PDB file of C-alpha atoms in Angstrom:
ATOM      1  CA  UNK H   1       0.000   0.000   0.000  1.00  0.00           C
ATOM      2  CA  UNK H   2       3.075   2.275  -0.547  1.00  0.00           C
ATOM      3  CA  UNK H   3       3.329   2.851   3.210  1.00  0.00           C
ATOM      4  CA  UNK H   4       3.940  -0.743   4.303  1.00  0.00           C
ATOM      5  CA  UNK H   5       7.513  -1.658   5.166  1.00  0.00           C
ATOM      6  CA  UNK H   6       7.873  -5.331   4.247  1.00  0.00           C
ATOM      7  CA  UNK H   7       6.231  -8.253   2.464  1.00  0.00           C
ATOM      8  CA  UNK H   8       6.491 -11.594   4.254  1.00  0.00           C
ATOM      9  CA  UNK H   9       6.205 -15.154   2.920  1.00  0.00           C
ATOM     10  CA  UNK H  10       6.305 -18.285   5.081  1.00  0.00           C
ATOM     11  CA  UNK H  11       8.261 -21.473   4.407  1.00  0.00           C
ATOM     12  CA  UNK H  12       8.043 -24.705   6.415  1.00  0.00           C
ATOM     13  CA  UNK H  13      10.635 -27.502   6.407  1.00  0.00           C
ATOM     14  CA  UNK H  14       9.422 -30.902   7.666  1.00  0.00           C
ATOM     15  CA  UNK H  15      11.876 -33.310   9.237  1.00  0.00           C
ATOM     16  CA  UNK H  16      12.040 -36.976  10.135  1.00  0.00           C
ATOM     17  CA  UNK H  17      13.611 -40.215   8.920  1.00  0.00           C
ATOM     18  CA  UNK H  18      12.255 -43.714   9.430  1.00  0.00           C
ATOM     19  CA  UNK H  19      13.868 -46.358  11.656  1.00  0.00           C
ATOM     20  CA  UNK H  20      13.740 -50.154  11.538  1.00  0.00           C
ATOM     21  CA  UNK H  21      10.925 -51.587  13.639  1.00  0.00           C
ATOM     22  CA  UNK H  22      11.433 -53.130  17.061  1.00  0.00           C
ATOM     23  CA  UNK H  23       8.819 -54.019  19.680  1.00  0.00           C
ATOM     24  CA  UNK H  24      10.681 -52.463  22.620  1.00  0.00           C
ATOM     25  CA  UNK H  25      12.737 -49.934  20.655  1.00  0.00           C
ATOM     26  CA  UNK H  26      12.425 -46.173  20.969  1.00  0.00           C
ATOM     27  CA  UNK H  27       9.823 -44.455  18.798  1.00  0.00           C
ATOM     28  CA  UNK H  28      11.463 -42.073  16.300  1.00  0.00           C
ATOM     29  CA  UNK H  29       9.749 -38.723  15.927  1.00  0.00           C
ATOM     30  CA  UNK H  30       9.042 -36.249  13.139  1.00  0.00           C
ATOM     31  CA  UNK H  31       8.999 -32.459  13.451  1.00  0.00           C
ATOM     32  CA  UNK H  32       9.062 -29.237  11.426  1.00  0.00           C
ATOM     33  CA  UNK H  33      10.612 -25.771  11.290  1.00  0.00           C
ATOM     34  CA  UNK H  34       9.295 -22.459   9.981  1.00  0.00           C
ATOM     35  CA  UNK H  35      11.060 -19.442   8.498  1.00  0.00           C
ATOM     36  CA  UNK H  36       9.721 -16.116   7.261  1.00  0.00           C
ATOM     37  CA  UNK H  37      10.903 -14.181   4.215  1.00  0.00           C
ATOM     38  CA  UNK H  38      10.842 -10.378   4.117  1.00  0.00           C
ATOM     39  CA  UNK H  39      11.200  -8.069   1.118  1.00  0.00           C
ATOM     40  CA  UNK H  40      11.473  -4.351   1.824  1.00  0.00           C
ATOM     41  CA  UNK H  41       9.358  -1.793  -0.024  1.00  0.00           C
ATOM     42  CA  UNK H  42      11.339   0.978  -1.731  1.00  0.00           C
ATOM     43  CA  UNK H  43       9.647   4.306  -2.469  1.00  0.00           C
ATOM     44  CA  UNK H  44      11.121   6.467  -5.206  1.00  0.00           C
ATOM     45  CA  UNK H  45      10.162  10.069  -5.977  1.00  0.00           C
ATOM     46  CA  UNK H  46      10.635  12.523  -8.833  1.00  0.00           C
ATOM     47  CA  UNK H  47       9.518  16.117  -9.277  1.00  0.00           C
ATOM     48  CA  UNK H  48       9.475  19.182 -11.499  1.00  0.00           C
ATOM     49  CA  UNK H  49       9.727  22.957 -11.154  1.00  0.00           C
ATOM     50  CA  UNK H  50       8.393  25.172 -13.949  1.00  0.00           C
ATOM     51  CA  UNK H  51       8.746  28.946 -14.218  1.00  0.00           C
ATOM     52  CA  UNK H  52       6.631  31.558 -15.978  1.00  0.00           C
ATOM     53  CA  UNK H  53       9.299  32.881 -18.356  1.00  0.00           C
ATOM     54  CA  UNK H  54      10.521  29.332 -19.003  1.00  0.00           C
TER      55      UNK H  54
ATOM     56  CA  UNK K   1     -11.003 -57.800  50.598  1.00  0.00           C
ATOM     57  CA  UNK K   2      -7.890 -57.436  48.459  1.00  0.00           C
ATOM     58  CA  UNK K   3      -7.103 -53.972  49.868  1.00  0.00           C
ATOM     59  CA  UNK K   4      -6.969 -55.192  53.474  1.00  0.00           C
ATOM     60  CA  UNK K   5      -4.092 -55.758  55.877  1.00  0.00           C
ATOM     61  CA  UNK K   6      -5.335 -58.245  58.475  1.00  0.00           C
ATOM     62  CA  UNK K   7      -7.905 -60.966  59.104  1.00  0.00           C
ATOM     63  CA  UNK K   8      -9.318 -61.435  62.615  1.00  0.00           C
ATOM     64  CA  UNK K   9     -10.777 -64.680  63.978  1.00  0.00           C
ATOM     65  CA  UNK K  10     -12.622 -64.718  67.304  1.00  0.00           C
ATOM     66  CA  UNK K  11     -12.909 -67.576  69.791  1.00  0.00           C
ATOM     67  CA  UNK K  12     -15.647 -67.537  72.435  1.00  0.00           C
ATOM     68  CA  UNK K  13     -15.212 -69.689  75.521  1.00  0.00           C
ATOM     69  CA  UNK K  14     -18.568 -70.149  77.290  1.00  0.00           C
ATOM     70  CA  UNK K  15     -19.006 -71.092  80.928  1.00  0.00           C
ATOM     71  CA  UNK K  16     -21.758 -72.425  83.159  1.00  0.00           C
ATOM     72  CA  UNK K  17     -22.650 -75.447  85.292  1.00  0.00           C
ATOM     73  CA  UNK K  18     -26.147 -76.749  85.941  1.00  0.00           C
ATOM     74  CA  UNK K  19     -27.549 -77.164  89.451  1.00  0.00           C
ATOM     75  CA  UNK K  20     -30.480 -79.083  90.878  1.00  0.00           C
ATOM     76  CA  UNK K  21     -33.800 -77.316  90.389  1.00  0.00           C
ATOM     77  CA  UNK K  22     -35.674 -75.575  93.170  1.00  0.00           C
ATOM     78  CA  UNK K  23     -38.553 -73.123  93.152  1.00  0.00           C
ATOM     79  CA  UNK K  24     -36.917 -70.714  95.609  1.00  0.00           C
ATOM     80  CA  UNK K  25     -33.250 -71.551  95.008  1.00  0.00           C
ATOM     81  CA  UNK K  26     -31.148 -68.838  93.392  1.00  0.00           C
ATOM     82  CA  UNK K  27     -30.739 -69.142  89.628  1.00  0.00           C
ATOM     83  CA  UNK K  28     -27.289 -70.090  88.288  1.00  0.00           C
ATOM     84  CA  UNK K  29     -26.052 -68.044  85.355  1.00  0.00           C
ATOM     85  CA  UNK K  30     -23.972 -68.767  82.264  1.00  0.00           C
ATOM     86  CA  UNK K  31     -21.415 -66.400  80.774  1.00  0.00           C
ATOM     87  CA  UNK K  32     -18.777 -66.164  78.060  1.00  0.00           C
ATOM     88  CA  UNK K  33     -15.450 -64.557  77.245  1.00  0.00           C
ATOM     89  CA  UNK K  34     -13.858 -63.774  73.893  1.00  0.00           C
ATOM     90  CA  UNK K  35     -10.329 -63.765  72.478  1.00  0.00           C
ATOM     91  CA  UNK K  36      -9.140 -62.693  69.044  1.00  0.00           C
ATOM     92  CA  UNK K  37      -6.321 -63.679  66.689  1.00  0.00           C
ATOM     93  CA  UNK K  38      -5.066 -61.533  63.807  1.00  0.00           C
ATOM     94  CA  UNK K  39      -3.096 -62.621  60.733  1.00  0.00           C
ATOM     95  CA  UNK K  40      -1.636 -60.188  58.222  1.00  0.00           C
ATOM     96  CA  UNK K  41      -2.344 -60.279  54.484  1.00  0.00           C
ATOM     97  CA  UNK K  42       0.284 -60.654  51.754  1.00  0.00           C
ATOM     98  CA  UNK K  43      -0.368 -59.476  48.193  1.00  0.00           C
ATOM     99  CA  UNK K  44       1.496 -61.025  45.278  1.00  0.00           C
ATOM    100  CA  UNK K  45       1.849 -59.166  41.985  1.00  0.00           C
ATOM    101  CA  UNK K  46       2.609 -60.561  38.535  1.00  0.00           C
ATOM    102  CA  UNK K  47       2.268 -59.120  35.054  1.00  0.00           C
ATOM    103  CA  UNK K  48       2.915 -59.516  31.351  1.00  0.00           C
ATOM    104  CA  UNK K  49       3.986 -57.287  28.461  1.00  0.00           C
ATOM    105  CA  UNK K  50       3.142 -58.131  24.848  1.00  0.00           C
ATOM    106  CA  UNK K  51       4.334 -56.357  21.717  1.00  0.00           C
ATOM    107  CA  UNK K  52       2.475 -56.272  18.415  1.00  0.00           C
ATOM    108  CA  UNK K  53       5.119 -58.171  16.436  1.00  0.00           C
ATOM    109  CA  UNK K  54       5.596 -60.646  19.294  1.00  0.00           C
TER     110      UNK K  54
END
Protein backbone atom coordinates (compact mmCIF):
# COMPACT_ATOMS: atom_id res chain seq x y z
CA UNK A 1 0.00 0.00 0.00
CA UNK A 2 3.08 2.28 -0.55
CA UNK A 3 3.33 2.85 3.21
CA UNK A 4 3.94 -0.74 4.30
CA UNK A 5 7.51 -1.66 5.17
CA UNK A 6 7.87 -5.33 4.25
CA UNK A 7 6.23 -8.25 2.46
CA UNK A 8 6.49 -11.59 4.25
CA UNK A 9 6.21 -15.15 2.92
CA UNK A 10 6.31 -18.28 5.08
CA UNK A 11 8.26 -21.47 4.41
CA UNK A 12 8.04 -24.70 6.41
CA UNK A 13 10.63 -27.50 6.41
CA UNK A 14 9.42 -30.90 7.67
CA UNK A 15 11.88 -33.31 9.24
CA UNK A 16 12.04 -36.98 10.13
CA UNK A 17 13.61 -40.22 8.92
CA UNK A 18 12.26 -43.71 9.43
CA UNK A 19 13.87 -46.36 11.66
CA UNK A 20 13.74 -50.15 11.54
CA UNK A 21 10.92 -51.59 13.64
CA UNK A 22 11.43 -53.13 17.06
CA UNK A 23 8.82 -54.02 19.68
CA UNK A 24 10.68 -52.46 22.62
CA UNK A 25 12.74 -49.93 20.65
CA UNK A 26 12.42 -46.17 20.97
CA UNK A 27 9.82 -44.45 18.80
CA UNK A 28 11.46 -42.07 16.30
CA UNK A 29 9.75 -38.72 15.93
CA UNK A 30 9.04 -36.25 13.14
CA UNK A 31 9.00 -32.46 13.45
CA UNK A 32 9.06 -29.24 11.43
CA UNK A 33 10.61 -25.77 11.29
CA UNK A 34 9.30 -22.46 9.98
CA UNK A 35 11.06 -19.44 8.50
CA UNK A 36 9.72 -16.12 7.26
CA UNK A 37 10.90 -14.18 4.22
CA UNK A 38 10.84 -10.38 4.12
CA UNK A 39 11.20 -8.07 1.12
CA UNK A 40 11.47 -4.35 1.82
CA UNK A 41 9.36 -1.79 -0.02
CA UNK A 42 11.34 0.98 -1.73
CA UNK A 43 9.65 4.31 -2.47
CA UNK A 44 11.12 6.47 -5.21
CA UNK A 45 10.16 10.07 -5.98
CA UNK A 46 10.64 12.52 -8.83
CA UNK A 47 9.52 16.12 -9.28
CA UNK A 48 9.48 19.18 -11.50
CA UNK A 49 9.73 22.96 -11.15
CA UNK A 50 8.39 25.17 -13.95
CA UNK A 51 8.75 28.95 -14.22
CA UNK A 52 6.63 31.56 -15.98
CA UNK A 53 9.30 32.88 -18.36
CA UNK A 54 10.52 29.33 -19.00
CA UNK B 1 -11.00 -57.80 50.60
CA UNK B 2 -7.89 -57.44 48.46
CA UNK B 3 -7.10 -53.97 49.87
CA UNK B 4 -6.97 -55.19 53.47
CA UNK B 5 -4.09 -55.76 55.88
CA UNK B 6 -5.34 -58.25 58.48
CA UNK B 7 -7.91 -60.97 59.10
CA UNK B 8 -9.32 -61.43 62.61
CA UNK B 9 -10.78 -64.68 63.98
CA UNK B 10 -12.62 -64.72 67.30
CA UNK B 11 -12.91 -67.58 69.79
CA UNK B 12 -15.65 -67.54 72.43
CA UNK B 13 -15.21 -69.69 75.52
CA UNK B 14 -18.57 -70.15 77.29
CA UNK B 15 -19.01 -71.09 80.93
CA UNK B 16 -21.76 -72.43 83.16
CA UNK B 17 -22.65 -75.45 85.29
CA UNK B 18 -26.15 -76.75 85.94
CA UNK B 19 -27.55 -77.16 89.45
CA UNK B 20 -30.48 -79.08 90.88
CA UNK B 21 -33.80 -77.32 90.39
CA UNK B 22 -35.67 -75.58 93.17
CA UNK B 23 -38.55 -73.12 93.15
CA UNK B 24 -36.92 -70.71 95.61
CA UNK B 25 -33.25 -71.55 95.01
CA UNK B 26 -31.15 -68.84 93.39
CA UNK B 27 -30.74 -69.14 89.63
CA UNK B 28 -27.29 -70.09 88.29
CA UNK B 29 -26.05 -68.04 85.35
CA UNK B 30 -23.97 -68.77 82.26
CA UNK B 31 -21.41 -66.40 80.77
CA UNK B 32 -18.78 -66.16 78.06
CA UNK B 33 -15.45 -64.56 77.24
CA UNK B 34 -13.86 -63.77 73.89
CA UNK B 35 -10.33 -63.76 72.48
CA UNK B 36 -9.14 -62.69 69.04
CA UNK B 37 -6.32 -63.68 66.69
CA UNK B 38 -5.07 -61.53 63.81
CA UNK B 39 -3.10 -62.62 60.73
CA UNK B 40 -1.64 -60.19 58.22
CA UNK B 41 -2.34 -60.28 54.48
CA UNK B 42 0.28 -60.65 51.75
CA UNK B 43 -0.37 -59.48 48.19
CA UNK B 44 1.50 -61.02 45.28
CA UNK B 45 1.85 -59.17 41.99
CA UNK B 46 2.61 -60.56 38.54
CA UNK B 47 2.27 -59.12 35.05
CA UNK B 48 2.91 -59.52 31.35
CA UNK B 49 3.99 -57.29 28.46
CA UNK B 50 3.14 -58.13 24.85
CA UNK B 51 4.33 -56.36 21.72
CA UNK B 52 2.47 -56.27 18.42
CA UNK B 53 5.12 -58.17 16.44
CA UNK B 54 5.60 -60.65 19.29
